[PDB]
Amino acid sequence: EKAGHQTSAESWGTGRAVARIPRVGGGGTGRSGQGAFGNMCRGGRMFAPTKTWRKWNVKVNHNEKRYATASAIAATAVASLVLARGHRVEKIPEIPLVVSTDL
Amino acid sequence: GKGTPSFGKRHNKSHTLCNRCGRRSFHVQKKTCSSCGYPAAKTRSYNWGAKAKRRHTTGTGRMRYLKHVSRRFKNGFQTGSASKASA
Amino acid sequence: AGVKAYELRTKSKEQLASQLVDLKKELAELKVQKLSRPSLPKIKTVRKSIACVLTVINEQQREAVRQLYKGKKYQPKDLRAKKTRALRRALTKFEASQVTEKQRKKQIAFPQRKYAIKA
Amino acid sequence: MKKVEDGNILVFQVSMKANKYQIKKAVKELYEVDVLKVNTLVRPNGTKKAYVRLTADYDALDIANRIGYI
Amino acid sequence: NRKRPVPKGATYGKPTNQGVNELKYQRSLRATAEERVGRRAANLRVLNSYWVNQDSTYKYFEVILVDPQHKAIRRDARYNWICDPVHKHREARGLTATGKKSRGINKGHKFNNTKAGRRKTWKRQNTLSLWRYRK
Amino acid sequence: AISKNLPILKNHFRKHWQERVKVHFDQAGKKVSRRNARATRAAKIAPRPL
Amino acid sequence: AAQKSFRIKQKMAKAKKQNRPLPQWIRLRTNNTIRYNAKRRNWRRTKMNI
RNA sequence: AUAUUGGCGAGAGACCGAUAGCGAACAAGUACAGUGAUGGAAAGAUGAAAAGAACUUUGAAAAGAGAGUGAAAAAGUACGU
RNA sequence: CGUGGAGGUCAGUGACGAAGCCUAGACCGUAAGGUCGGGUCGAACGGCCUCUAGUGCAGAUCUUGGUGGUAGUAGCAAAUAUUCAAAUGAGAACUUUGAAGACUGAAGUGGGGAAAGGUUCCACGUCAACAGCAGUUGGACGUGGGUUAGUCGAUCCUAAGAGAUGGGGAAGCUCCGUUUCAAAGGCCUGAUUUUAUGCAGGCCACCAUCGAAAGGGAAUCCGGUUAAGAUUCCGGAACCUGG
RNA sequence: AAACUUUCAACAACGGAUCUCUUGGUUCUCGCAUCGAUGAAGAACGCAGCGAAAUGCGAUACGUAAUGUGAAUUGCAGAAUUCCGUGAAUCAUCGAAUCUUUGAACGCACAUUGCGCCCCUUGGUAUUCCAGGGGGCAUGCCUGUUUGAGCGUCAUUU
Numbered sequence A: 001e002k003a004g005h006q007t008s009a010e011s012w013g014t015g016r017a018v019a020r021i022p023r024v025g026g027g028g029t030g031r032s033g034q035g036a037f038g039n040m041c042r043g044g045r046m047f048a049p050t051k052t053w054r055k056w057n058v059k060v061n062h063n064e065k066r067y068a069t070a071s072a073i074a075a076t077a078v079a080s081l082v083l084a085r086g087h088r089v090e091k092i093p094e095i096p097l098v099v100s101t102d103l
Numbered sequence B: 001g002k003g004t005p006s007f008g009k010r011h012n013k014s015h016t017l018c019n020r021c022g023r024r025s026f027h028v029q030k031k032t033c034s035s036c037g038y039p040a041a042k043t044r045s046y047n048w049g050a051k052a053k054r055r056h057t058t059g060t061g062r063m064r065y066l067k068h069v070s071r072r073f074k075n076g077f078q079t080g081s082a083s084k085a086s087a
Numbered sequence C: 001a002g003v004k005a006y007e008l009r010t011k012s013k014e015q016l017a018s019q020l021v022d023l024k025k026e027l028a029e030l031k032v033q034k035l036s037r038p039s040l041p042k043i044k045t046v047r048k049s050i051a052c053v054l055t056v057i058n059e060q061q062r063e064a065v066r067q068l069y070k071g072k073k074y075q076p077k078d079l080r081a082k083k084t085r086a087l088r089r090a091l092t093k094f095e096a097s098q099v100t101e102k103q104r105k106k107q108i109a110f111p112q113r114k115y116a117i118k119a
Numbered sequence D: 001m002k003k004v005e006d007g008n009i010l011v012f013q014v015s016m017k018a019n020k021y022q023i024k025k026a027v028k029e030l031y032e033v034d035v036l037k038v039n040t041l042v043r044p045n046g047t048k049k050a051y052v053r054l055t056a057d058y059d060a061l062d063i064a065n066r067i068g069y070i
Numbered sequence E: 001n002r003k004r005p006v007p008k009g010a011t012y013g014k015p016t017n018q019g020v021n022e023l024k025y026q027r028s029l030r031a032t033a034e035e036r037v038g039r040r041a042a043n044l045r046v047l048n049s050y051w052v053n054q055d056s057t058y059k060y061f062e063v064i065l066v067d068p069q070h071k072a073i074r075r076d077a078r079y080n081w082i083c084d085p086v087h088k089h090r091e092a093r094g095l096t097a098t099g100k101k102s103r104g105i106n107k108g109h110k111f112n113n114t115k116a117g118r119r120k121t122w123k124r125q126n127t128l129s130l131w132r133y134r135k
Numbered sequence F: 001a002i003s004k005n006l007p008i009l010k011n012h013f014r015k016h017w018q019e020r021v022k023v024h025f026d027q028a029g030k031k032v033s034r035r036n037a038r039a040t041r042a043a044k045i046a047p048r049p050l
Numbered sequence G: 001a002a003q004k005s006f007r008i009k010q011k012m013a014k015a016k017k018q019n020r021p022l023p024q025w026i027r028l029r030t031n032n033t034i035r036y037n038a039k040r041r042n043w044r045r046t047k048m049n050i
Numbered sequence H: 001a002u003a004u005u006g007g008c009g010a011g012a013g014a015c016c017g018a019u020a021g022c023g024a025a026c027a028a029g030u031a032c033a034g035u036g037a038u039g040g041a042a043a044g045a046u047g048a049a050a051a052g053a054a055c056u057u058u059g060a061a062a063a064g065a066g067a068g069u070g071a072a073a074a075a076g077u078a079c080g081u
Numbered sequence I: 001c002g003u004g005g006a007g008g009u010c011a012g013u014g015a016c017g018a019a020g021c022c023u024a025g026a027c028c029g030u031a032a033g034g035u036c037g038g039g040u041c042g043a044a045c046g047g048c049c050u051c052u053a054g055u056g057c058a059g060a061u062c063u064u065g066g067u068g069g070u071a072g073u074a075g076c077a078a079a080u081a082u083u084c085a086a087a088u089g090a091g092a093a094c095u096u097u098g099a100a101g102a103c104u105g106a107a108g109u110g111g112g113g114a115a116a117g118g119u120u121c122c123a124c125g126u127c128a129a130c131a132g133c134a135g136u137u138g139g140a141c142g143u144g145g146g147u148u149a150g151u152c153g154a155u156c157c158u159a160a161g162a163g164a165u166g167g168g169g170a171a172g173c174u175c176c177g178u179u180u181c182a183a184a185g186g187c188c189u190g191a192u193u194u195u196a197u198g199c200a201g202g203c204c205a206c207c208a209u210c211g212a213a214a215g216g217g218a219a220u221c222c223g224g225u226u227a228a229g230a231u232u233c234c235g236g237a238a239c240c241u242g243g
Numbered sequence J: 001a002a003a004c005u006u007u008c009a010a011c012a013a014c015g016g017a018u019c020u021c022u023u024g025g026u027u028c029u030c031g032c033a034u035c036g037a038u039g040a041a042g043a044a045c046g047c048a049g050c051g052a053a054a055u056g057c058g059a060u061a062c063g064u065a066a067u068g069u070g071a072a073u074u075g076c077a078g079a080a081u082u083c084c085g086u087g088a089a090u091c092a093u094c095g096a097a098u099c100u101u102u103g104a105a106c107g108c109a110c111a112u113u114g115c116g117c118c119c120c121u122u123g124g125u126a127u128u129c130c131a132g133g134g135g136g137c138a139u140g141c142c143u144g145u146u147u148g149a150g151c152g153u154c155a156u157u158u
């Protein structure tokens, strides 16, 4: 949150034959005079800096979720879907594939 | 001649080296230092000067004593010595 | 090469004392020689050998002082435990542990009784 | 060296903290020689240089190659 | 009162803050008295204090300090609490008697602001709380 | 400004609100903590019931 | 400055020993990436400000 | 139980990828500026390996031309593309 | 249409050459774009369904960097002035020696210093850069060398001032005050002669300190010497202070 | 018709975009509580066989001791015998030390490597002068010790 803004830069005002973007003060170094803060400016702060309190997680209705995984299960039993989904089951005995509880 | 020619007269120091912080910032007449505050009991530093602070705080130096304190504590401030093994 | 810590620990105060002067003298010797000659790594090890002697000399001297102080209430601050300015002036386990008479009497009578539910 | 082969002066880089008295004593004890006069100056590179004239009882060029250098 | 320690009365700002002469310190004179002897005897610990006398010019306080290095205290179970590092200069933080008064700390409706601590209750009720599944 | 036929909102964000924003990323994190401390309290409290 | 102080005088001596070309064998060190002394000084291009 | 843009030790990311990301991926709060408070940069990439071009020739030299190294010199410490 | 990143899938392309870049070569699309060949390259990278955004530039006297025309152009004209020859060198209008012609004309272009610089001093080597032509020269580059004190200064003193202390203000950073409403000592010295050191006469004392390399102030001169130091070294001749 | 201008192309330049890299940055989370008068943070000057830096160190100076590991370090040098060993190492760990001049900074000062005082000791005729060596003298406050002040004030000699 402090990136781009670690300057004491100011606009030089107009009348100086340069754009009014804030510029770095002092002399002695190539940073002196350069454009400061702001998105067009090399070094400056980015447009609308990314924040953490962005919404990351999404709420979903418990029942939609359930509905969701239920259809998802019902689908695991459709040879057309499981093949199209890219699994190789061209050769499995049957589907749903049940296997001895020894497993 | 408020410019070039009066610059020719600039040969008297306002500031010498400061005993405490080292900078040529020791005001001769005021007998004090603009960067570190010496000979104040305290060290000069303001909160509107995050860069200033950052430049001088702990860790920018050698940390002669303080560096080792972390390890010491890890081993519980051990008294004694290691003991030597077998064969 | 160069002396060894244990070889020196057997020696006597005044033996070590002379050991040292024998070393300063050879160091002086190599300084002069270093001049007329390109590169003298030999000098490294006496420089350190001098360190090793002085170290051990002091282990002794300190230990002595440390010993003739055993069991006495005020040791020097040199030999006192360092720790931490805080940890130093923290209450001793004794002081820490002091309970009031009223509370001695109370903790004995009604201590935290271990117990369990089910039956 | 020319101040030895002509002047009877030993030229030592001495400690920065050592004074003229202290130079005299150590030059006597380390070399078993007698000191007439000690001059000292702080070389521009931070080291101190002592100019030590010995008495006519001694020949500095002797006790020099005695020391070792030449 | 506390005369606003400002240049020539000059406030340089809105006319509300343009006062100099009728402003009162938010700590008791007693709080001042404690803190000043507490600074002088900084090896001690300020336990408490009490008024004893006053004229028009002055008020007078007796201040009860307590040595925390003195083993009579360190061994006294009723008082070794003040030996702790956590009580260094309790007067300077408003932890003495006069302090928790001025600091406005008691239960009940009258102390809604200040009792969980003025600035703290503020900062609380001035915080946006954002959960992962937004509420 | 004021326009259209909309409810009159009262969103109090005129105060450097950004300085005091608390997002609970550690919701997961402090649940685990909350447990790894109930089990570890149950351990030392012997057969007592917490 | 004619009769200087010792503090200055020392600061000077330091500064002069600092002023020298890179010890050339350093360039032979493994993984060395220093090809010159980028802190070299000169009495007429930069002052020492006491 | 609560706080925690500091300190020490860790595990991470639908973050940035050298004009981006901290000012600083580098002898960066350095070089430099200013009486002072303060201001404050630029600057990463030969090759797996220096095998960093022996030798000859032209030249006052720097270098050129051959030769040689290398998978490559359409990689020659001006050096990936 | 296109871009960075994400889930899924083509068991997708690839050192037998990924990506990238070059190409008045080819094809597809109204277009955003897509595909291919040839050259260059050298370690990665696509298509389709979906997710996501720091997602598309000609402009903002926009930001950083890089490059043009201007242009071999403006210009390199203050401060009297140069010339012959030898040497050296790969090389000489410019370096060194020699000669000539001249200037500064002691109110200096002479001989020293204060402030300031900090090695620029001196020697040897030496020309990539710098000295706005040049360079074999240099306050440049490289490597070395060099600054010697009882008497010269600082150090002592007081100046305008600066500023601890007992205090008195101030929420506090601190402000005031300097003999200040303060119990503010340091010396003569015999005793004792278990001892060189308690004691016994005792006067004296509105008293920190810092502040002058031009003010005040104890004392050195001549000759000789170095590549470069000298009222500092040598030689001789003195003087002050303390004991 | 050259030259010149312009356009395209190849090769060569200039410049450093593109692509691919990444011991860095950035944000999230988890565990922990340890600076200082036992002189901290920070500052100055030094310290290597050959170092200007960065890094590390402090006159025992890129380190001394202790412990682990077990043969390096490496630009060159040099070692080193210790390579079935109390033992390489610019290793790791670290419990013993050293730790210049400073800094809250403490005898007084400080644009000064300026100026005092005390004890022990060593030289020079020396209890008094000089020099060398070692150890010392800040302030506020608390508890205690010793020595004191006040017709503040008690009791006594007689």
Ligand SMILES: [Mg+2]
Pocket: A003, A004, A043, A044
């Ligand atoms: Mg940025």
Ligand SMILES: [Mg+2]
Pocket: B009
């Ligand atoms: Mg003037």
Ligand SMILES: [Mg+2]
Pocket: B014, B029
């Ligand atoms: Mg002035």
Ligand SMILES: [Mg+2]
Pocket: B039, B040, B041
């Ligand atoms: Mg101070």
Ligand SMILES: [Mg+2]
Pocket: D040, D041
């Ligand atoms: Mg002298």
Ligand SMILES: [Mg+2]
Pocket: E011, E012, E013
């Ligand atoms: Mg105001």
Ligand SMILES: [Mg+2]
Pocket: E014, E016
């Ligand atoms: Mg208002």
Ligand SMILES: [Mg+2]
Pocket: E016, E017
């Ligand atoms: Mg109001």
Ligand SMILES: [Mg+2]
Pocket: E047, E048, E095, E096, E097, E098
């Ligand atoms: Mg209380």
Ligand SMILES: [Mg+2]
Pocket: E112, E113
């Ligand atoms: Mg309220």
Ligand SMILES: [Mg+2]
Pocket: E126, E127, E128, F012, F013, F017
């Ligand atoms: Mg709100």
Ligand SMILES: [Mg+2]
Pocket: F014, F015
């Ligand atoms: Mg508003």
Ligand SMILES: [Mg+2]
Pocket: none
């Ligand atoms: Mg948080």
Ligand SMILES: [Mg+2]
Pocket: F050
């Ligand atoms: Mg519970």
Ligand SMILES: [Mg+2]
Pocket: G001, G002, G003, G004, I213
């Ligand atoms: Mg002078």
Ligand SMILES: [Mg+2]
Pocket: none
């Ligand atoms: Mg100049």
